[PDB]
Amino acid sequence: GSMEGILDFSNDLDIALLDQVVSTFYQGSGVQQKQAQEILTKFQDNPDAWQKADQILQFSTNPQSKFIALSILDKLITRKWKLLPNDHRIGIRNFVVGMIISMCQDDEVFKTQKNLINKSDLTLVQILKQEWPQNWPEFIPELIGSSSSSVNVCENNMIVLKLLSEEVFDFSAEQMTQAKALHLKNSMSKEFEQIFKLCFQVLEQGSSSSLIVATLESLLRYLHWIPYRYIYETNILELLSTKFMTSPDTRAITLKCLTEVSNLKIPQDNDLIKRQTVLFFQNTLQQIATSVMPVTADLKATYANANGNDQSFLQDLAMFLTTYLARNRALLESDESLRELLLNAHQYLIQLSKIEERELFKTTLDYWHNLVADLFYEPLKKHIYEEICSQLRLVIIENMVRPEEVLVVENDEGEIVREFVKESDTIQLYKSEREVLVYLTHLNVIDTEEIMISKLARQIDGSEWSWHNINTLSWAIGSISGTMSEDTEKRFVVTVIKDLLDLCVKKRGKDNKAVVASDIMYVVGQYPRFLKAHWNFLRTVILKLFEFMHETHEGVQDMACDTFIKIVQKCKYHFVIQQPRESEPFIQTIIRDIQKTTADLQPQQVHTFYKACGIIISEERSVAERNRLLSDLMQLPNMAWDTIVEQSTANPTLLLDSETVKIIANIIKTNVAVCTSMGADFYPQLGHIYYNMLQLYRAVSSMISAQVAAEGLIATKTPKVRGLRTIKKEILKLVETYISKARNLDDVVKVLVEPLLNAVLEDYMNNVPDARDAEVLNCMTTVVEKVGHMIPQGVILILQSVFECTLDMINKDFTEYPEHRVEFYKLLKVINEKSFAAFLELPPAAFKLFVDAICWAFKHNNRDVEVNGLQIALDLVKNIERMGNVPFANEFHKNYFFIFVSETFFVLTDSDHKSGFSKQALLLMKLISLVYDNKISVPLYQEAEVPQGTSNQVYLSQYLANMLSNAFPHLTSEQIASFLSALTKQCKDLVVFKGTLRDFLVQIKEVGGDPTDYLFA
Amino acid sequence: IHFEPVVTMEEDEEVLYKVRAKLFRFDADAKEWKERGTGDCKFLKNKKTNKVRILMRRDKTLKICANHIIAPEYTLKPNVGSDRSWVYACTADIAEGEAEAFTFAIRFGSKENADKFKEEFEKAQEINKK
Amino acid sequence: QVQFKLVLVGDGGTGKTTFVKRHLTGEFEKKYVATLGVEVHPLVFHTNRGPIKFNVWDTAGQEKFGGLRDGYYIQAQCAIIMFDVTSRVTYKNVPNWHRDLVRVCENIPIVLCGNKVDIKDRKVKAKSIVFHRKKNLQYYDISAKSNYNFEKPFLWLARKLIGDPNLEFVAMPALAPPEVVMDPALAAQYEHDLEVAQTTALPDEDDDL
Ligand SMILES: Nc1nc2c(ncn2[C@@H]2O[C@H](COP(=O)(O)OP(=O)(O)NP(=O)(O)O)[C@@H](O)[C@H]2O)c(=O)[nH]1
Ligand SMILES: */C(=C\C(=O)N1CC(F)(F)C1)n1cnc(-c2cc(C(F)(F)F)cc(C(F)(F)F)c2)n1
Ligand SMILES: [Cl-]
Ligand SMILES: [Cl-]
Ligand SMILES: [Cl-]
């Protein structure tokens, strides 16, 4: 195609053609646009393309072409500047400077080509980063001088200085060496006196200009780093807080500046400076009230209208008020003449807190947290804010977000339904709102109670009735549990429940009933202290939850199950004892009627119910009685199990019933649920099913294998095979769950482990990859974690069965078998921690695969795998070091030391594993320190490669210099030598060592980095 | 004394059946099913012409992910991996614009819902026959 | 007609392309195929104020595939900055992307999106996400995989661009579909295509739907 002509550098660049390709890309569409994009990228990437930049800038009539030209230059300047002959550096500086001057002196261009001029300015700043001040000492003085010649030049100079400050102070940490950043920061600091003079003069002699706005934009950046004296020893605060607050065009930027002023480092014990800090705040608030809106204004309405920049302004006002007050409100709290200012500022925050905008509300809520936590502790302060706090109680109570526990919500058709998914993004918000409301309740429990009780009264009489209103109030009432004394809470809860029961009688139809039921469940579940004191009520609550377990409304039904277990987790002791005037502990009553109670529940809900019963049973510490309760609880699943075990042992065929498969899975899941809450106490139940369960595991394994053989790999996708594998997975889960909680480890080893390994390991090894359950690896991890020290031969067996076959599944790419990948490395990690001897016993070929596997883990971008890989490597090195001067350790170092060093360097430097930097650095430092400390007892080099006496320190440096020379050929020998000298000297100081690595990572991205940078200290 | 006061194209259709579902289309070029939408799948009978269509819209965006006549020629078939889905060939769906043929799969929250859909699908087919 | 240039930026692997594809076709692409420079896609939403068209410039997040980089931002009218809540480095880079973006586009509405909230092990804690406040960016937790809040960035941007805070998505008109009979000549090829479809398992059979 014709657009490709611009890629032929053997001919002259057709600028007209370039402008067409550029236009096609930015203004075109579809295929033509796509082709132009590819062409432009190729053009841009040509390493000689920079040589065309002058011609483009001169002859192009397309501003985007010129932008692209500048991007080409930026790439050259940032990466290859010192590769250029000196005349090309001068030439480039000159035409960039000249273009900027030329575009500023033509008013129409300066007005209409802002994008191109900003890009030019940034490109200039890239040259400054390379050249200034050492090879451009007069830049600042000449910029200052040029500013007087022209208003356009002066404004543009402010943009250049803003960008320079950003590049030096805000964005240098990642992009420059420590030494170069210090040099540029010191250089800007040394000339700032004169920069500030220009800025202050401009601000003094102007009003609302684009020049003023640009100057203020530059000031915002300077405030990040300049000494406070520039702000406090000049008249600049008066200008910022008065004059520049009056015009809307300057108001936005001025407010941001004042926010950063509020963050300056300022002396603590100077009365004069305190006065100035008060004064600018006073001025600012006066300007807001007279020029923008009074304290009474409805900011909720204004924000919602969204005119002009109003939303941004209100956001910025919130940021200003919260920032200032969190730091300085004490300055306003003692002097009676400052009380009105203090309270007015807080009244604006109250108004801002009524805005409907979740992210803004979090910002103001953070402030309110800061305030109320201070008032909770600081003597004599809360009374100042009593009216503010009272208003805040109302704001929070009226804007409570739905708790995670409340599972019903109103849909688009006005029906109250079960939520489709969890509202995950309001979890933190709820916690934050609760935190503030709890503090507010403590600050004035009478006010809080009066507000809540009177609001509830207005729900009852109907005056304020709505789903929104009863919900937010109920959630607020639940959320303050624990704030009142038991005695006070008693009266409060009784009044609330009486009123909530009135509503539930009156408000009818499934929607209302669901709303009110959800609110009572939430409140009741939030007050276990009350429930523990009032058994008759608790029993009544539980019986009512059981009724709700038969609700046709699935939301209410599900919430009743959650509320049951929530109450049980806190009140379980009261279910296990025999209460006065009861004939039996309530746990007996629950268990006896469990079939009827749970008949309408979905299986997972039944499992939750059983889990709750397990919590209660584990309260019984008399073993005989606990085991009897456990036996009673498990009666139904054990009776179903016993009949199945009889049938399956007669016929493997009866297990081909999908109905039976579901029944079995649900039995095992019920066991898992009970084991989860009972832990070590579950053992007698485990013993009842264990041997038949492992036989069932084997039988189901045979069915799966048979199905894959008969139908192909596709069989693994079928409902039948998935159902069979669910049985295997749940069995593994049950065993893992028990062992993870077991207190009698002797029984685990003597009774559980051998049959488990016998049942699971060969089956994993001898299935095709797609039929292997990652859950086997997960189960073995827990086995090794808990009893690995007691089963050395068992650990060896685990490795033999899973190591090589799993490695082969995951070592072709980084994505297949993701769960196997993750569990594989967790397993290797714990074996290396708990039973290192297992790796010592591996044949040398298998040990080599182990090293390969660890390094392979390094190269993952998946954090779960990467982190474990780096830890295994570090633990392995420690394991080897612990062995001392023995043949295995010597051979390990001879074979693998440099493999670990080089592999670690590779992931450190390839820009694709940045998440692992800290642990990579730790590992590298350990490796280097081993040689530095002479902890490797044999030569790391083969003989005649280097003189016979040669220390490993000398050889390590030679090896690394050669490795780096070949991997990074654009580095000078001195850069490499200096880097390595520093790195090795610093191998006992991790923070310094990491700085040196970060400096190296900067230098490898450019040419001609200064080797003295590695002397930074 | 007078005080002057202060100054979808599914309207002609009956909803025979509604069910929550996930719809897939088969990409034959790749060899995989790709999701087309999740939301309410409705069977709509046009009150003027008595013809029954499937109309399905995505949650939140409300974009049409299925729009086609429940043709008497169509046949719901099981998918190998599911007991709660149907697959079928559609010759003329206009969710994206101009009529286009697809192989669809539709999956439901449960087997019971899937079996209800098929019964309703076949009822609708008999209506379209009349 | 009413169309707006939207640039989508953020670290490689954050879900930019997956997010756009979800909106374009409804699909969820599991594979990670790195975007090369930029991919442009038109995307239309129907609203109570008429149709709004976004020309989505889905840019490459991988430095090695960055192409024209900030060159893509020229004349953008809005933007989405993406990160991954399971990867702290991607949040750490948000200020870098924002810097590069606003240098070219000085006054546009921008949404910041923390993607992949479906993943249980979240690493960028909700409480940590504050960068948007001083920069006046909207923020949403999202998941391209579960569709959690997936419509929110476009709804907010549309509201800002049309200048109507009460703008809502509305159900697009649904024209009567045609009656077509299968071509008898293609019936045998129909049989084959359906067989392959029936015997290719549906993905994510453990999902609620
Ligand atoms: N779990 C989960 N995975 C997701 C989500 N969104 C995207 N992914 C996955 O993340 C990977 C990368 O997605 P992709 O959209 O290519 O990322 P990108 O930001 O466009 N990368 P690039 O900048 O290189 O083009 C894919 O494997 C995709 O399936 C999500 O919400 N949840
Ligand atoms: C209202 C019950 C109702 O619909 N009634 C009573 C009638 F007059 F017979 C008609 N309603 C909704 N929720 C409750 C309620 C819930 C709970 C629980 F904590 F379990 F959520 C407890 C009770 C209790 F009885 F203990 F007070 C009531 N009542
Ligand atoms: Cl431009
Ligand atoms: Cl208790
Ligand atoms: Cl040298």
Ligand SMILES: [Mg+2]
């Ligand atoms: Mg992409």
